[PDB]
Amino acid sequence: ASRGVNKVILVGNLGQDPEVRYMPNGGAVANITLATSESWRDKATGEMKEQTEWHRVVLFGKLAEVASEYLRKGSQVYIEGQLRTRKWTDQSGQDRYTTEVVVNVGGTMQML
Amino acid sequence: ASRGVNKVILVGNLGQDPEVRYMPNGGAVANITLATSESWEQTEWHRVVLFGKLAEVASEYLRKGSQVYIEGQLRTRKWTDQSGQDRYTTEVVVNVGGTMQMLG
DNA sequence: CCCCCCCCCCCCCCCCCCCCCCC
């Protein structure tokens, strides 16, 4: 598991309540989507120049349930995970790719 | 950056020479594809886009199997393809408080 | 080490974009 580092650290708020589901053979998989905003004002004072980014975080086991029990819409949380892009096929049988921050082995989540 | 933190840190090797391009006013956009793997060997590919100065250096000194350290943000952009189907794509972008660095 | 995954950021002086499958 050497050959480099895959690390993403996030601090942000949930868009909606955690969407927990069960994976085959003992579920415990919680999908949360969080926002991080950023600001600036490049071409002349625009009184604002916000820009929200949405991240798709996925927790497993213990943490999946913790989020399930204590994370609600607004919760602010700290996340440390790895990026993983998964390929899946859609209705029309076309190839799709989804990138996520999965909180696994050396991961971690924590309410703020 | 009101609201939280959005940051990704990668250390891996380019799977292919830097594909450098020059967008409109201000040509400087390099795209690289970084590989990071793990034994226990499952690898993951990353799309990192460098801009400006970082862009030129990537073009200048980075080559295929090169190992780099990257500090950036996570961005996912949507674009409809020649089919009328909405697509999304997330990449690590090295902008503001980000950095790139040649290792070894 | 890269075999490729993916079209492709716009902070931090002093909301919530929402589009997103099931490691």
Gyration radius of chain B's alpha carbons = 15
E-only strand ranges, chain A: 5-14, 19-21, 29-37, 52-60, 76-89, 95-103, 108-111
Give the contacts of B10 (CB within 8 A, at least 6 positions apart).
Answer: A4, A5, A6, A7, B34, B36, B46, B48, B68, B69, B70, B92
A75 touches strand C (CB under 7 A): no
Nearest to A72 by CA among A10, A108, A18: A18
Give the contacts of B11 (CB within 8 A, at least 6 positions apart).
Answer: A4, A5, B36, B67, B68, B69, B70, B103
- What are the tokens at A106? 């050396």
All domains in chain A, ordered by first residue: 1-112 (2.40.50.140)
**Number of Cβ atoms within 10 Å of the Cβ of B5:** 14
CB < 7 Å to strand C — which of 80-99 in chain A?
84-89, 96-99
The method of structure determination was X-ray
- The C1' atom of C12 and the CA atom of B1 lie apart, in whole Å, by 6
Nearest to A11 among B5, B34, B76 (CB): B5
Give the contacts of A44 (CB within 8 A, at least 6 positions apart).
Answer: none
Give the contacts of A94 (CB within 8 A, at least 6 positions apart).
Answer: B85
Residues followed by a break in chain A (C to N exceeding 2.5 Å) are: none
Could you report how far apart the first and last alpha carbons of chain B are, in Å? Answer: 33
Resolution in Å, one decimal, please: 2.8
For every residue of B4-15, DSSP letters joined together read SEEEEEEEEEES
Nearest to A72 by CA among A112, A16, A27, A25: A16
Of all residues in chain B, the one with the smallest CA distance to A86 is B44
Of all residues in chain A, the one with the smallest CA distance to B68 is A4
Using an 8 Å CB-CB cutoff, list residues of chain B that contact chain A: 1-13, 34-41, 43-46, 67, 73-76, 85, 89-90, 92, 96
- The nearest CA of chain B is from the CA of A33 a distance in Å of 13
